[PDB]
Structures are given as structure tokens and as C-alpha cells.
Amino acid sequence: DYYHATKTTIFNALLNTIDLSQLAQLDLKQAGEEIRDIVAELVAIKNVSMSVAEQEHLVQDIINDVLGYGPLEPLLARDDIADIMVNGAHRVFIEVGGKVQLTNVRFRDNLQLMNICQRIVSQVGRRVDESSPICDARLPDGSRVNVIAPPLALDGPTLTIRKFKKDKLTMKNLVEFASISPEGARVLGVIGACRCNLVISGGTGSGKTTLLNTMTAFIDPTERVVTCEDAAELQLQQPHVVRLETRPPNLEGSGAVTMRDLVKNCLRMRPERIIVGEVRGPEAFDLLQAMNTGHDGSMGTLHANSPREAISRIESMITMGGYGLPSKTIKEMIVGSVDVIIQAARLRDGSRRITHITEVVGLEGDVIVTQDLFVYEITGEDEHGKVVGKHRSTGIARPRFWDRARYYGLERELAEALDAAEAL
Amino acid sequence: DYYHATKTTIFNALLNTIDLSQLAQLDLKQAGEEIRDIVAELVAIKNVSMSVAEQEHLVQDIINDVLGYGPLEPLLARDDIADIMVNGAHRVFIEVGGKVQLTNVRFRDNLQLMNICQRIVSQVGRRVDESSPICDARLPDGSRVNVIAPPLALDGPTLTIRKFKKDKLTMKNLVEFASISPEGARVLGVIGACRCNLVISGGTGSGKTTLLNTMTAFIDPTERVVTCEDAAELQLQQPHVVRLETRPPNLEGSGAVTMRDLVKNCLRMRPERIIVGEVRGPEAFDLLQAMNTGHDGSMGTLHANSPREAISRIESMITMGGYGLPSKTIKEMIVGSVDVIIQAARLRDGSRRITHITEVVGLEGDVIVTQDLFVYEITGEDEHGKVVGKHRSTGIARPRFWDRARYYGLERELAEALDAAEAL
Amino acid sequence: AFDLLQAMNTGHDGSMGTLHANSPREAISRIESMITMGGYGLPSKTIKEMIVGSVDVIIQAARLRDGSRRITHITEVVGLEGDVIVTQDLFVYEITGEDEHGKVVGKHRSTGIARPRFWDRARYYGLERELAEALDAAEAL
Ligand SMILES: Nc1ncnc2c1ncn2[C@@H]1O[C@H](COP(=O)(O)OP(=O)(O)O)[C@@H](O)[C@H]1O
Ligand SMILES: Nc1ncnc2c1ncn2[C@@H]1O[C@H](COP(=O)(O)OP(=O)(O)O)[C@@H](O)[C@H]1O
Ligand SMILES: [Mg+2]
Ligand SMILES: [Mg+2]
């Protein structure tokens, strides 16, 4: 029980000796030495039940307060923990083995938690406060962080940290999980090798990035690939790959390199494929240019729950760009540039699927027309509560990209896969 | 009559001795001690008929007016008082037991009332004055304060304090009022425990927020719930509830956080149920996506008169978002997302009943088909003027969610409830 | 206007408003125009349904040719039918002719309705008999 009182006393003593206002003075190593010496001198002057190990641990806690993330360090250190949910300063839950449990972890007060949240979301040049209480970001280590501030969250700052697994899935894994039928897997292989301008839509956590990463495995090793990203997610194996990453604006709101700038410059690097990590704003426009003016095979994911919604949001982003283009101009551009719209999506039981493999056939009137090569048919739910369904081909044996497939000598495999799926 | 004169004289003497302008010198506690000493001294220096009891009363009144929330402190202290409505400095009303009544409470003048309002709204850091005459805020204790300043309010500052009604109706209370037959109550228990996505329709004041709060008593405690609201009304007793709340735009349109933004963010908080306070705008779309993408158990109340009109309203809201989805796409979304629509309604005689427990069976052609488990057949009118009706099960033995009910082991309870309903 | 209707349709029954129009149908059209001016992205049918659900009565006053003012209608928003709002006038001022001084001559007559749309609302407050008597007396002509 003396741990809390000892910590408070040591914090007061450290502030008296080395105050937080002296930041950048007595830096990381200097602080690690000075605070340790001060804690030793205090343990000598001020009697405490803390032993030598306890004194070293108090020095460690001071180090955390000066350098670390507070009581989250024990949790983030562990690897079996998949999610950390803070729900205010006095209730920290953790997901272990797929089940949520309450931990005996407690922040000092909502101010400590609200400062730690700002510290965590500052790693990517982002700030969350009463000016903008909602903040979603992804850390370098490969985890997602969501924060809501006290103005909205009544109970206090709410922090959600999902630590996603490192190793990714291959198309073989997707076939194993029944995510896509093997015939669909062969058609996807043809599409990836055939150099089709495909857009991978989907919902949050639906599998967009994983699907893109599995599709890039079909890229011919001789091609010059350029991958524009925000978090260095993709893991390509080709030898001739150029990896780019946008730079978030600094604290002064200057020096930013938006994804739009990266894509615009990628047109100068003479790449054979541009792979946008995710389309969010005006860069959509530029990406289509790349898809249209010779860089066939360019891929890029976006957030949407169906091909129609994905196309609508592409139009919305292009309009946000402010180029003053009419609606039908944008629709003609989309129809000319995009070939396939693979639709990832999560099902009502939480399991992922590839629900559609669409195809922008053409533009009629003012509405774009598409035909699904595959569709997910849900039949019901099994005794375990999991959604049951099957991937059915619509029978189309002449996709609009047939010429591309033939030019590379893959039309035979495409026809074989489509007719084998049609046999069912 | 001498009480007012003595109080005024003692206040002047205290200001002469202990100046309220001396802030940071003789502060709250020192101010109270000095006020007590000064009142004791002036009792003899300023001959007042007030005895020891009246002397202490005046001491406390000085301590309040100097520091506290003026004459409001008694009203805020009581627990039966639900609302406090001050129209100027002379017409303080209060709501007790559902009845608004005037009270013999007055303020010195409008300046005192405005200062009190400024002190009250300063707890949450907001300020109200002739510069920004309107202030709506939520105090830390759950009460809501609304203040309007003299420039707009002709009669003087207007204050409205709505305390948090901390007692709600349970399901058994709704049964006692003959609002839902006990068989219907147990069917609702099965539906809530079985985590079926449900929309709670109803008209104005028909009592659908209360029904939602009763339904949220069946949520399994181990589930992470996230409730979005415009004004905090639900009181969930589970230990894992996360409470959010929209922020309306200020007078200049900045700092707005719509329910749509909250519901979109909640998809990234890893919830297991999203419980939207009330669906009015485009957020319906997001909510349905939450229902579709694995967050089974999500709820939400909307304003409609019949389940068919509720579905039409959902379609209209989803179209209002401007996502460019055709009608049949939205209808398929609604069919796949919603499972049970519960219809509350307030009848002619001022009574409130639950008139439908509908299930969205599926699509026939271009119109969504529904089947009612329960219906309130209104026969006629009591001679007293009341309306007379009976709850009856439509005879549907196995509801659409029978498999879902069985997966949780509640098939026995559902069968018993529907047999008892059918056995009458 | 939008907010006002929202107030009328969220428990604040009894609210009142005034606008500038010559006929109740013109008043409804101008309400739709204002709500569209709000810029909330609501289609016409949504606004018409909102007007139907919120408003109950529309009292149309007017100033006549001879400068005289007379309440010319007491209309009721009966409900939507297709894409047009239906209305029924409880009272109307029928202009029969002119006086010898150039004045306008007319009479207030009820359209004979006995059960207006707000019959239940009136009954809930113990006024159904007053309304019935008033309408019957008006219909006695
Ligand atoms: N078909 C699938 N089967 C199983 N898990 C999947 C599948 N697709 C994606 N995932 C899981 O989703 C997580 C990554 O989702 P991701 O698509 O990268 O996020 P986003 O779609 O938001 O970019 C990984 O942890 C991975 O295990
Ligand atoms: N079945 C019922 N019988 C009697 N009174 C009820 C019933 N349900 C709710 N009430 C009361 O009526 C009020 C309804 O308000 P509320 O539930 O907020 O309706 P809404 O949210 O639709 O406006 C509540 O204050 C509650 O005390
Ligand atoms: Mg991604
Ligand atoms: Mg309500």
C-alpha cells in the first residue's frame, strides 16, 4: 500500500530537484542519471519501506514519467494482449486469447490519461484535445490507436489500442479460410498478373490492405513498382520496388508531403505500377491519371461497403480536389481507368469475406454499369452461429479484361477457372 | 422585515472588513472563517434582534452569496426537484413530481442572477455574457445548464437546470402498467439476450427511450457497449459501458461533432454493441453498417408511427446521406441489418402501449416483408373514457431468430413464452 | 421554419407561427421553400411529410379589396396523397357581392365538417363537446 505514497513523494521530490519545465535540459541519459541519483539521495534522506530493488523500481517509474507512457508500459510490453481499452482513468480492459477481461490497472486521474493519450498520438504528428476530441491514427510499431476526449466521452478520455499481428496472410491462407474460393483465387491471380487497374474497396478491418498485399504477390518481378503509403504496411517481395511514405505536417503546420504530392511525383519516376496504400482525398484524381496514362496495373484501396459506394466516393474525392470537372467527365474517367473492383467486407459473425469481384463494363447515361464475376451468396448460419455461404460465379466467360489476359498468355487459365466455377 | 435590513448592513460591514475583491487573499476557507468571525463581531457591533440561530443563518447566507450559488443552493440540494427554471430574478419555478410550480425564491436583482449564472457555467470552462449570450453545457454531476443573457432575454437572465433523472422504469414496471403482456416481456428478454439488432420505433413521447433503456438490461455484462447520445439519458448498469455525446456547433458554427461522426468512430473502438440514442440523420447508414459488420446487438430509436413507416424513414435517412445507392440496395441493407422492430405508441387516452414486435423477414419484389410476433388489438373504449385492448401473439411459432435464440440456449424460454401467449 | 416544425413534432405541441402568404397552399409552398433554403438536403416529399406531421391548423387572414380584414380560412393539413398535401377548410368567408359604398359583402360559413382531424386532441382536454356544438351551430346555416 506504501507504493502509491512513495511514488507521490518521489514525484514531488523529483519535481523539486528536476522539474518538468526543464525539458530538453538533462536529456534522456542525463535524466536517467540525475533522477536515479536524486531517488537514491531521497531514499537515504527520507526513510521508506522500499528496498534496493524497490528504490530501483521507483527510479524506473520516474523514468517512465519522464520518458515512458505510464501504466501502459507493462501492457504494451506483453504480446499475448491483443487489445487495450481504457474507458476512462479507472477501468483498463485487455483482450487476451480473444476474450476481454478487466485488469488491475489504474491511472492517477483523467489528467494523466489525457496527457498520455496526447503523447501517444503525437508520435505521428497528431494531437487530440478539446479542439478536436476525436483522433484515429496508426503507430509505427504496427498498431492502431483511437482516442476520444472528455468533451465527448463523459467518463473521461477513452483510448483503444489494437496491436495487430505482424505476419500477414497469403492467397493460400485466404483460400484456406474460405474467404475466396479456389476458382476465385485463380481469377485473382490472373487479374494480378494481367495488369488490371483494380480498386480494393471494403469496410474497416475488412481486409483491404491484406488483400492488396496478396494481390501484389502476382506482380512480375521485372516491373518497377512504386508504393505510396502512410504507414509502411505493404510487404512486397519483388526486387525492383520503390517504397514511399508521406510526411505528416510538423507541429507548426508546415512541411507536409501529402499523398497527392507523392502520386503526382510518381508519374515522373517512370514506374510501371503505382500502388497507392489508401485513397482518402484528392489524390484519387491523380491515381486515375496513372491508371489511364500508361501505368496499367496500378492498385489502390479505399473505404467503402460496395462497388457502387466505392465509385461514389471516388467521385466525391475527385470533386473535393477542386478541379472543376463535371460529373459525367469524372464518370468517364473512372470507367476508362478502373477495371476491377474487388470488395472486401466483414460478415455479421465477424469473419471476413471477398463478397464481390466486380467489373466496370462501361458508362450508360449518367450511371456506371458493372457486372460481377463472383458474388457471395449467404444461405444461413450453422449450429455454431457462423455465417454460411458460397462464392458463385455469374457465368460470365468473357470479362472486359479478356484482351489483357490473352496478351500475356493467361486467357487459357482464366477460361478454365471461370468454366470450372461455372460447373457448380 | 428587520431580517433583510440586518443582512444588508452585515453584508456592507463584511465588504468593508473582508472585501470580496480580495480574491487570492482570504480565499474560500479563509473567507468562510473571516465571514463567521465578522458576523459574530457585528452581531454586537451592529445590534440585530437575530439570536444565535439567526446569526448563524446570516453567517451561512454571507458565506453563500460571497462564494456559493446564491439562493439556488437549497433547490439544487433537494432530490425530488427535477428541474429549476428561473425566468429573470423574480420568477424561479421548479418541477416536482412532474408538476411545474412557482416558488417564493427571488434574487437580489438581475446582476446577481447573471453573476450566479456565470459562476455556474464556469465549472465546465464556458462563459456566458453579452458577448456570447447563449450557453448550453453539461455539469460534471449529469445536470444540464442552459443560460440566456439579457441582450436576448428581455426579462433578464434565463436559467434552466435539468438534473439527471436517476430512476428509470424497469421491465416489470412496464408490465404493471399493462403496456406489455408478461409473455411479451419474456419475448423481449429473449430478443435482448439473443443480441438481435433492433430498432425501437414510436411517436413523440410514446416512451421509446425508456423501452430502449429497459432492453439494455439484458445485455450480457461481458460485452463492450458503446452508447452515442445527444443528451445523456440512458443509464446502463453493465460494467463495460462507454458513453459518448455529440457536441452542437457554437454560435459561429465551429466545433460540431454530429452523431454521424460518433457512430463512424465507434466502428473503430472495437465495440460489441452500438446503442445510438436516437437516429435522425444520415447516421442511420453508419448504424446499419455497424449491424451488418459483426456488431450484433446494436440498437437505436427512431421517430415513426408504424414499422413500415419506420423502414421508409430509415431508407429516407440513408438516401439523405448522398452515398448514391439505389433504392433496392438500401432495402437489401435494411433487410440484412435489422432483425426486430419494436413499436411503442401513445394512444388517444394518454396511455402508452407496445403495439408491435415486428420481424423483417426479407424482400418480396421491391418491398420489404414483415411478420408481427405480437400485436395490440384495440377493441373499443372503457366507459370511463380509457381505451381497451389486448396483446395477442399472431401464432407464429418459430420466429426468424429461432436459430439465433437456440444458439444461446434460450429456445426453451422462447417456446414457453410463445406457447403461453398462444395458450390464451 | 425547419426548427419550428421540429419543435411542433417533438412534444412541444401547441407551438404557433406566422408567415407571409396569401393562401394556405401558398403558405405550405413557402414553408417548403424556407426549409429548402435551410440546405439540409431534404427532398420535397420528406419536407411535405414533415409539414403534414407537424402542422395541424392553418388560419388564413387577409385584407380585402375595400381595406377590410377578415379571417378567410381555417384550414387543416389532412395528409399527404401522392406528392400533394391535402387540406380541408373548417370555415371559409364566401364573398357574395359588393355593398352600395364599394364595400365587400361576405359570410363566414362552416364546410359542414363534424369531426376535424384534431378531434382526438380536442377530446383529450375535455373540449370535444364545445367543438361539436360550435361546428353544429355553424352548420345550422
Ligand atoms: N481473409 C481474412 N481472413 C482472416 N483474417 C483476415 C482476412 N483479411 C484480413 N484479416 C485480418 O485483418 C487484419 C488486417 O486488416 P486490414 O485489412 O489490414 O485493415 P484495413 O482493411 O482497415 O486496412 C489482420 O490482422 C488480418 O489477420
Ligand atoms: N409504458 C409507460 N407507461 C407510463 N409512462 C411511461 C411509459 N413509458 C415511459 N413512460 C414515461 O413517459 C416518459 C416518456 O419519455 P421518453 O421515454 O423519453 O419518450 P421519448 O424518448 O420517445 O420522448 C418518461 O418520462 C416515462 O417516465
Ligand atoms: Mg489499411
Ligand atoms: Mg427519446
Author numbering:
A (entry chain F), B (entry chain A): 80 to 503
C (entry chain B): 363 to 503
Wording from the paper:
The bacterial tight adherence pilus system (TadPS) assembles surface pili essential for adhesion and colonisation in many human pathogens. We show that CpaF assembles into a hexamer with C2 symmetry in different nucleotide states. Nucleotide cycling occurs through an intra-subunit clamp-like mechanism that promotes sequential conformational changes between subunits.
CpaF incubated with ADP yielded our highest quality map at 3.1 Å resolution overall facilitating a build of the NTD2 and CTD with excellent sidechain detail for all subunits. Henceforth, this CpaF structure obtained in the presence of ADP is termed CpaFADP. However, ADP/Mg2+ was now bound in each nucleotide-binding pocket. In CpaFADP, the map around the nucleotide binding pocket was now fully ordered with the P-loop well resolved. Crucially, HIS box residue H382 was turned away from the nucleotide with P-loop K287 fully engaging the β-phosphate just like in CpaFAMPPNP open state. Broadly, this means that when ADP/Mg2+ is bound to CpaFADP in the open state, then the nucleotide binding pocket of the open’ state subunit resides in a conformation similar to the open state of CpaFAMPPNP. This finding suggests a model where the CpaFADP open’ state has the appropriate conformation and geometry of key residues to support AMPPNP (or ATP) binding when ADP/Mg2+ is bound in the open state subunit. As the nucleotide binding pockets are solvent accessible in both these states, the CpaFADP structure is consistent with the nucleotide switch model where ATP and ADP binding in the open’ and open states, respectively, would potentiate counter-clockwise motion.
